[PDB]
Amino acid sequence: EEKGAYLVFDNASNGTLFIVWKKEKVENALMFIKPTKEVPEFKFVNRNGKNELIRNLQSDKKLFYSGICQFVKEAKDIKGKLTLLQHFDSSFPIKVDLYFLKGSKVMPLNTGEPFVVQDIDAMSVLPKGSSSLKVKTMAKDMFVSRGNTEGASISF
């Protein structure tokens, strides 16, 4: 976990998400990214390891959802794995579970497990009421449109 990315929440703007690109162990993170192949150095150097994803989460809890898609976006960009850490949900009023689209099949994220995000068709951030996309097989077009109405989606 030392090498990878971490989703962090900051009190900036009464709610900001932060994705750390580092080779160190970041704590107090809500989510994580695990790269299988080498991680882009320019993301380390240009961002200096810090990148603020989305801000003012105060105004709308769904912004956190969207910020999450922006987070896994990085994972799908470098072609790694996405890990949803659990802990924040006990303190933060947002508890959700992530879903990926692969082929015609939809797959939910396993809590604290690096899950294949690299060659996904689409991704979305659904709340505990994730049954929107919780089916045996799914349309890539529906996946994003559904997740978007859930408040977060991101599709190739």
Side-chain angles (χ1 to χ4, degrees), residues 96-109:
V96 302
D97 50 290
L98 289 60
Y99 282 51
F100 294 134
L101 202 300
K102 272 93 54 51
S104 301
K105 190 190 301 300
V106 46
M107 277 291 188
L109 217 322

Side-chain angles (χ1 to χ4, degrees), residues 98-136:
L98 289 60
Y99 282 51
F100 294 134
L101 202 300
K102 272 93 54 51
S104 301
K105 190 190 301 300
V106 46
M107 277 291 188
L109 217 322
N110 287 31
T111 310
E113 183 174 290
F115 191 34
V116 50
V117 61
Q118 46 186 150
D119 63 291
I120 60 168
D121 286 68
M123 174 276 179
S124 57
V125 195
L126 273 36
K128 307 294 84 170
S130 50
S131 186
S132 309
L133 301 176
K134 189 162 58 185
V135 58
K136 309 96 191 301

Side-chain angles (χ1 to χ4, degrees), residues 51-110:
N51 180 90
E52 290 166 61
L53 278 167
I54 193 167
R55 63 108 183 198
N56 189 216
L57 305 181
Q58 185 190 30
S59 58
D60 176 37
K61 97 182 309 180
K62 293 303 185 67
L63 296 183
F64 176 44
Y65 299 39
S66 185
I68 296 177
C69 79
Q70 311 183 332
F71 176 69
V72 324
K73 160 196 173 308
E74 311 294 84
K76 96 191 210 304
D77 195 79
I78 100 287
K79 303 298 179 296
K81 274 69 217 292
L82 196 277
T83 299
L84 168 89
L85 305 171
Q86 187 182 331
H87 192 97
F88 70 101
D89 62 293
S90 308
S91 181
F92 198 56
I94 314 189
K95 56 200 69 182
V96 302
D97 50 290
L98 289 60
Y99 282 51
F100 294 134
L101 202 300
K102 272 93 54 51
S104 301
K105 190 190 301 300
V106 46
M107 277 291 188
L109 217 322
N110 287 31

Side-chain angles (χ1 to χ4, degrees), residues 12-65:
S13 304
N14 299 89
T16 301
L17 294 194
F18 160 25
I19 172 182
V20 58
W21 277 122
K22 81 281 166 299
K23 298 80 101 185
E24 292 178 277
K25 164 76 255 188
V26 180
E27 279 290 272
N28 290 150
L30 289 34
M31 298 177 55
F32 172 80
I33 297 177
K34 202 290 287 289
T36 44
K37 293 294 181 61
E38 300 78 272
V39 235
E41 186 182 272
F42 186 56
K43 276 64 180 184
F44 294 141
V45 54
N46 179 85
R47 285 152 62 150
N48 201 86
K50 66 150 294 187
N51 180 90
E52 290 166 61
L53 278 167
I54 193 167
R55 63 108 183 198
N56 189 216
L57 305 181
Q58 185 190 30
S59 58
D60 176 37
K61 97 182 309 180
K62 293 303 185 67
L63 296 183
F64 176 44
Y65 299 39

